[PDB]
Amino acid sequence: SSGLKLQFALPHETLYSGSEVTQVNLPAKSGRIGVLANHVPTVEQLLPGVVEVMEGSNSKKFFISGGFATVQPDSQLCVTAIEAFPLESFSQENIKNLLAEAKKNVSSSDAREAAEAAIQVEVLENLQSVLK
Amino acid sequence: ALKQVAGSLKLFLAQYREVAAFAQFGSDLDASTKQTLVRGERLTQLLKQNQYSPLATEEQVPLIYAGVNGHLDGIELSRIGEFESSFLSYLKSNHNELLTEIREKGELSKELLASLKSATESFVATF
Amino acid sequence: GEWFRDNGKHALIVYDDLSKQAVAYRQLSLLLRRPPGREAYPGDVFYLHSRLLERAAKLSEKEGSGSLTALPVIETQGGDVSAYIPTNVISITDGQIFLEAELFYKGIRPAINVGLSVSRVGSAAQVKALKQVAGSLKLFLAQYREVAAFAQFGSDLDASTKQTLVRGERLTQLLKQNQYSPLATEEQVPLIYAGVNGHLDGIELSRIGEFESSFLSYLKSNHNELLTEIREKGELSKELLASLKSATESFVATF
Amino acid sequence: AAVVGQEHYDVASKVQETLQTYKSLQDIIAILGMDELSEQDKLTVERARKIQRFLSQPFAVAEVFTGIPGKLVRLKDTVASFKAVLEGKYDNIPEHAFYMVGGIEDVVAKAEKLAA
Amino acid sequence: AAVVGQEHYDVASKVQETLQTYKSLQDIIAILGMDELSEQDKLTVERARKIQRFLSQPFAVAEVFTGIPGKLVRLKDTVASFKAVLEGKYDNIPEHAFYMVGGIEDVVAKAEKLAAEAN
Amino acid sequence: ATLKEVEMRLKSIKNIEKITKTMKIVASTRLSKAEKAKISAKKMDEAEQLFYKNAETKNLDKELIVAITSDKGLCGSIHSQLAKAVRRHLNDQPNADIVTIGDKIKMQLLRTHPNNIKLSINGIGKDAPTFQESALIADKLLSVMKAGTYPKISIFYNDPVSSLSFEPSEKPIFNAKTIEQSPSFGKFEIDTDANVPRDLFEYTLANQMLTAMA
Amino acid sequence: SAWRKAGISYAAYLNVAAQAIRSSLKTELQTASVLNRSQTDAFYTQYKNGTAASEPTPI
């Protein structure tokens, strides 16, 4: 058995399924993690960050919403999330600031709704660093 | 007298058949369409009367009264039957004065409604 | 009218209505104590109308080339075309222009049920200028009546059938013509041609009415030469088909 | 149009088309409900029901039947009433506010008296 | 009721209503089916269909047609029989067991015979 | 039976045929449209379930029951078949409370056991469900229902075996407490700092529910 | 900014990020598939032991 089979799927679209990958970089609660061919079976919670599937050829990088990641004993990593995001040609700085700024005003609104605003701030700030 | 207690009653029974046919679909009903459906179904059961059993005016008014208003809504359908006889026996024993006013006057005064109102609610509470 | 026909001319006669005639005749026949048939009509009632309608025809070149057209009117009782009188008339004539009150209420005026309305002569007696754009118009409308139930359902309809609905709604809206407002062939072709190809599909189904107005006035000021060539020639050459299309797409664009 | 006026004809025609489609969807409102209808349809259907009930009028002759005092509406106000309802200016008012009502003013008055 | 008795009157009426409700939904049954019938309505149908089949009775004179010996049932037992069916004390027994049956006892008897025939 | 009564009645049956005959074709469209939401939910489901395979997480030794249904009718025997399966499983543990998702199925069980019902959902039969809606529903089950305390949770959904046949399905939802006692757990590295088992329950309950509805 | 304290379940924690992301992209590359993917009209109702129920509310 050479390589590791990746299974990156979503509740609306499936990207990778039993596909061999050289390396993957997905943010974890404990901290940023990496995986290669043979990797010790670890089960960590994925936080709203950025994942990058590596290949012998140029590797593509997509933004992830969050979920779980589990590396099966048989050398098989499984990534589960909600929504996905392409390189940068998909997101727009202008489209983000609009809501982003409105989030700070949600703290001003009733706390019941401001609770979700705090969670948005984080995700939004990370979107800016993706611009690179 | 009977004209007051039942005004849009015929119109209401028309709405009942309108709602009764539409609930045939097998879809859930909201508070409105079920409320009228509950009452409309019981009014039809109150109208059922046995042959050879003519009822005076003083005995029709009270029954229709408790129907058009909504005091039977909170009673089971197979109960409406004995309810009629029981309610009548109740008035003929206690609130008989009222029956005597409705009979002679043939109309409903501001005072007669008050007593009649309280006589109904008091009986619903019983049993 | 035959006078005109015999002398080598053209005469149009409209019997409005044969239904009333039969009733009158029935009255005489009954009072005279003649045998009563179906619905109290004597056996010679059919011989009556058959001996009337057959009088109109198209005389040959030797006879004078004269002609007499007949448009008999029959009033049915609740769509019952199966009645006695109607069955007689419908059997003799050469086509019907069935009209329904329902279609009238919707707005479709005149309410001519395309589905039933038929003509045995057809294109034989229709201007080629309009025949070239009408051959297809019977098609779309035909498929529209079949997929008319789908229009009542959500957007869950596939794109294929949806396209039909887009046309039908608009093609049916174009046929709506106000009363006392006949249009010449030179003005019909331009409207049919824009409809068939589908240059109205982008236009709202509410503005279809004013579309006819502003479009005709346009041609009569910028493309008057095209209209007049259709009126005289009565046909549409490959040159006109292209010139008409270009003038249409231009107006639809500026609209 | 050349008799009752252009405005009068258009309003009258709209009312007729509304009541027709309503009766045309009668096979869907009982077999699939009101929710299945489109946004344009539901909005029309509601109106068709309001206009329908808005056509009813209490006569001073049959006052003994309806209990409500006769009401005589003027043609000039009549057309102005449905016109307003056809434009959706009263999509908030309840249907029962159009049943057995004379002038358009009474509709708003009635809808407000019920709310009490 | 002033002749056949109050109970007899009530039992009979219940049988009619039940049979009537089955007839009023007959149109629906041929079009949609019982799957579309409500829980309350679907229970009345089956019960109704049970009552209808139960109405049949083997005739001694028509034994040469049914091949089943005549069955004479008394009025007293008949009333109790249907009344017991209305109360819902035989909703477990299959409908076939009500077809061409005499006494109510014969229903339960015939129901048991059908258990051995099932393979 | 007059010519008019037969002509009017015969005409209204014909309208019904047109309404039903078109309902079928329209159904064929929503069918393929629900295949994309069905395959994308199964493939994703296998991703999360693969973990429970290699790592035994069975339940050893009060119960929450959820039934996935719609609110529309004219669907054949779907509100009867499911209302019958839950009924059987209810005879073994009557105490176990139920939280059906569908005003339609509600009335089915609301007659047999109006006690067990303590929460219902409406407005889902409309279009295909998404995780956005699914995770939100599972959220209330943890806030007002408190499913985290329930030792064992069961889910009821209809598994389409074919276009002409369906099969009622049931699948358990292991909670946090059952993730620890998992015989095969040590093989997987994990830090008892980020409540991994706690956050797995609140997530599994969402996805499994989404793969049940979709 | 605690989510598991006074916020919501982990299913909702990733949910808010799913809509924020899907709404942080271009308006041109936003199919209707995503629009209705963030839209929902479902209401919940708590019931008692006696068929009783609580005031209806939005999910």
Taken from the alpha-carbon principal axes, the silhouette of chain A is elongated
Main sheet: strand order of chain F = 2-1-4-5
Beta strands of chain A, count? 10
Number of domains of chain F: 1
Rg value of chain F: 21 Å
End-to-end CA span of chain F: 49 Å
Helix content bin of chain F: 40-55%
Q: What percent of residues of chain A adopt helix (DSSP H or I)?
A: 25-40%
Q: Report on the biggest sheet of chain F.
A: 4 strands, mixed
Q: If you compute it from the alpha carbons, what radius of gyration of chain A comes out, rounded to the nearest whole angstrom?
A: 17 Å
Order of helices and strands of chain A: EEEEEEEEEEHH
Beta percentage of chain F is 5-15%
Please report the number of helical segments of chain F. 7
Q: State the CATH topology of chain F.
A: Pyruvate Kinase, Chain: A, domain 1
Biggest sheet record of chain A: 5 strands, mixed
Q: Return the CATH class of chain F.
A: Alpha Beta
Which oligomeric state applies?
Answer: part of a larger assembly
Shape of chain F: elongated
Strand content of chain A: 25-35%
Number of DSSP E strands of chain F: 5
- The order of strands across the largest sheet of chain A is 2-1-9-8-5
Subcellular location (chain C): Mitochondrion inner membrane
Family (chain C): Belongs to the ATPase alpha/beta chains family.
Protein name (chain C): ATP synthase subunit alpha, mitochondrial
Subunit structure (chain C): F-type ATPases have 2 components, CF(1) - the catalytic core - and CF(0) - the membrane proton channel. CF(1) has five subunits: alpha(3), beta(3), gamma(1), delta(1), epsilon(1). CF(0) has three main subunits: a, b and c.
Descriptive overview:
Chain G: Keywords: ATP synthesis, CF(1), Hydrogen ion transport, Ion transport, Membrane, Mitochondrion, Mitochondrion inner membrane, Phosphoprotein, Transport. Chain G: The modification Phosphothreonine is found at residue 51. This is part of a larger assembly, with one copy of chain A (132 residues), two copies of chain B, two copies of chain D, one copy of chain F (214 residues) and one copy of chain G (59 residues). Chain B is mostly helical and 127 residues long. Chain B has a single domain, classed as ATP synthase alpha/beta chain, C-terminal domain (Lysin). Chain B is 69% helix and 0% strand. Chain D has one domain: Bovine Mitochondrial F1-atpase, Atp Synthase Beta Chain, Chain D, domain 3 (Bovine Mitochondrial F1-ATPase, ATP Synthase Beta Chain, Chain D, domain3, Orthogonal Bundle), CATH 1.10.1140.10. Chain D is 54% helix and 0% strand. Chain D has five helices and no strands. Chain D has helices spanning 6-24, 39-54, 63-66, 75-86, 104-115. A four-stranded mixed sheet of chain F has the order 2-1-4-5. In chain F, helix 3 (82-92) links the parallel strand 1 (64-67) and strand 2 (97-98). Chain F has helices spanning 3-33, 36-54, 82-92, 103-109, 131-143, 176-180, 196-213; strands at residues 64-67, 97-98, 119-122, 153-162, 165-173. Chain F has one domain: Pyruvate Kinase, Chain: A, domain 1 (3-Layer(aba) Sandwich). In chain F, helix 2 (36-54) packs antiparallel against helix 7 (196-213) and helix 5 crosses helix 7. The chains are: A alpha+beta (132), B mainly alpha (127), D mainly alpha (116), F alpha/beta (214), G alpha+beta (59).
